Enzyme design. Structure first.
Site, PDB file in Angstrom:
ATOM      1  N   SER A  45       4.315  28.427 -21.460  1.00 32.57           N
ATOM      2  CA  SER A  45       4.558  29.391 -22.321  1.00 32.57           C
ATOM      3  C   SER A  45       5.878  29.055 -23.337  1.00 32.57           C
ATOM      4  O   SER A  45       6.509  29.783 -24.430  1.00 32.57           O
ATOM      5  CB  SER A  45       5.239  30.683 -21.489  1.00 32.57           C
ATOM      6  OG  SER A  45       4.234  31.442 -20.959  1.00 32.57           O
ATOM      7  N   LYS A  48       5.557  31.208 -26.952  1.00 35.03           N
ATOM      8  CA  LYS A  48       6.014  32.088 -27.143  1.00 35.03           C
ATOM      9  C   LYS A  48       6.706  32.102 -28.181  1.00 35.03           C
ATOM     10  O   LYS A  48       7.103  33.173 -28.893  1.00 35.03           O
ATOM     11  CB  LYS A  48       5.770  32.500 -25.790  1.00 35.03           C
ATOM     12  CG  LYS A  48       5.283  32.912 -25.212  1.00 35.03           C
ATOM     13  CD  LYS A  48       5.262  33.660 -23.632  1.00 35.03           C
ATOM     14  CE  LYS A  48       3.881  33.691 -23.270  1.00 35.03           C
ATOM     15  NZ  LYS A  48       3.717  33.584 -21.705  1.00 35.03           N
ATOM     16  N   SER A 105       8.535  36.703 -20.334  1.00 34.67           N
ATOM     17  CA  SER A 105       7.364  35.563 -20.614  1.00 34.67           C
ATOM     18  C   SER A 105       6.263  36.500 -20.406  1.00 34.67           C
ATOM     19  O   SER A 105       5.425  35.244 -19.939  1.00 34.67           O
ATOM     20  CB  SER A 105       7.588  33.794 -19.642  1.00 34.67           C
ATOM     21  OG  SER A 105       6.217  32.971 -20.424  1.00 34.67           O
ATOM     22  N   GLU A 141      -3.717  33.485 -23.751  1.00 36.59           N
ATOM     23  CA  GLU A 141      -3.440  33.638 -22.584  1.00 36.59           C
ATOM     24  C   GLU A 141      -3.657  34.694 -21.464  1.00 36.59           C
ATOM     25  O   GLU A 141      -4.317  35.199 -21.796  1.00 36.59           O
ATOM     26  CB  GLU A 141      -1.465  34.246 -21.695  1.00 36.59           C
ATOM     27  CG  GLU A 141      -0.757  34.158 -22.579  1.00 36.59           C
ATOM     28  CD  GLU A 141      -0.341  32.602 -21.575  1.00 36.59           C
ATOM     29  OE1 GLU A 141      -0.713  32.555 -20.829  1.00 36.59           O
ATOM     30  OE2 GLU A 141       0.833  32.347 -22.168  1.00 36.59           O
ATOM     31  N   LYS A 209      13.559  28.423 -24.137  1.00 30.62           N
ATOM     32  CA  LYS A 209      12.305  29.597 -24.101  1.00 30.62           C
ATOM     33  C   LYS A 209      11.446  28.352 -22.897  1.00 30.62           C
ATOM     34  O   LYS A 209      10.905  27.029 -23.118  1.00 30.62           O
ATOM     35  CB  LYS A 209      11.151  29.942 -24.480  1.00 30.62           C
ATOM     36  CG  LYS A 209       9.950  29.581 -24.416  1.00 30.62           C
ATOM     37  CD  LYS A 209      10.381  31.267 -23.622  1.00 30.62           C
ATOM     38  CE  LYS A 209       9.180  31.618 -22.812  1.00 30.62           C
ATOM     39  NZ  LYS A 209       9.149  31.511 -21.102  1.00 30.62           N
ATOM     40  N   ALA A 212       5.277  26.841 -17.964  1.00 29.25           N
ATOM     41  CA  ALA A 212       3.958  27.130 -16.510  1.00 29.25           C
ATOM     42  C   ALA A 212       3.329  27.397 -17.114  1.00 29.25           C
ATOM     43  O   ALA A 212       2.875  28.114 -17.508  1.00 29.25           O
ATOM     44  CB  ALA A 212       5.514  27.012 -15.887  1.00 29.25           C
TER      45      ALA A 212
END
Ligand code: CL
Ligand code: CL
Ligand code: CL
Ligand code: CL
Ligand code: MG
Ligand code: MG
Ligand code: MG
Length: 263
Positions: A45, A48, A105, A141, A209, A212
């Site tokens: 992540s 992002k 997230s 994602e 940021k 995981a």
């Protein structure tokens, strides 16, 4: 600082996995410390932030509007989407999506933002245009979190993304308004911040940021420093560990504690 290196190595030993680490001076970009800086790791992540930088670049160019409302459906919802789960009927603005993607997230938020720019390939093209020759996004994602052995998809190196973060947060790549908005999203309070926020002295600045994924993937990118101003970029990545999540988090947090102690 060498003590931080020792803690990086101890994390590798405790986690049974590689750890990549870099620290940069934020003003000059000088590398202050590094371990496996050019090895590849899954983004998870952490991407992002890069996504929202691409969005803000479009805003600056008049090609996107932060107030544009994005409408989506139940089938767009993927796991770990705590904000977008609450807006099926009403939609969310681009601004709201970036806030969700960074601070919460939110996975679906990131997928929707990827649609706004035209997909993973368009993110990767933006990265290439700003001089990042390594980072790649290939999937959306949650599949980008797979962390498969021997897979180059959805990876970066510590060195590449540290430089990219510096380009986004400093200088003139983004307008001042957009720079500040990106920093604001990254600085906003989060529900839990085990990796670095938990190590950060009072009065210090952090814009961060975390990420995981599967197969041990974990990471953080950050700009941090004393006195309410950032002065360094730090990037930490690992993948492959099958230690518990708590152990992963603790080991990375101890790297951060060392960075702060030896600042
Ligand atoms: Cl090294
Ligand atoms: Cl290396
Ligand atoms: Cl769109
Ligand atoms: Cl964190
Ligand atoms: Mg609809
Ligand atoms: Mg704020
Ligand atoms: Mg706070």
């Amino acid at each position: 600082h060498p003590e931080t290196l020792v803690k990086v190595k101890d994390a590798e030993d405790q986690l049974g996995a590689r750890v990549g680490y870099i620290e940069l001076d934020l003003n000059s970009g000088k590398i202050l410390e590094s371990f496996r800086p050019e090895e590849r790791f899954p983004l998870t992540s952490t991407f992002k932030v890069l996504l929202c930088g691409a969005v803000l670049s479009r805003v600056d160019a008049g090609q996107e509007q932060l107030g544009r409302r994005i409408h989506y459906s139940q089938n767009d919802l993927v796991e770990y989407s705590p904000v977008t789960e609450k807006h099926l009927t009403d939609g969310m603005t681009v601004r709201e999506l970036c806030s969700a993607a960074i601070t919460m997230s939110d996975n679906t938020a990131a997928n929707l933002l990827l649609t706004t720019i035209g997909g993973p390939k368009e993110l990767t093209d933006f990265l290439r245009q700003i001089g990042d020759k390594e980072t790649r996004l290939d999937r959306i994602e949650p599949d980008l979190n797979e962390g498969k052995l021997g897979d180059l998809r959805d990876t970066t190196t510590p060195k590449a993304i540290a430089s990219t973060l510096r380009k986004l947060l400093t200088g003139e790549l983004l307008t001042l308004a957009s720079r500040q908005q990106l920093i604001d999203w990254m600085e906003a309070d989060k529900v839990a911040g085990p990796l670095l926020r938990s190590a950060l002295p009072a009065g210090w600045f952090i814009a961060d940021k975390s990420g995981a994924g599967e197969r041990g993937s974990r990471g953080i990118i950050a700009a941090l420093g004393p006195d309410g101003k950032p002065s360094r970029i730090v990037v930490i990545y690992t993948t492959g560990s099958q230690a518990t999540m708590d152990e992963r988090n603790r080991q990375i947090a101890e790297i951060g504690a060392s960075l702060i102690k030896h600042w």
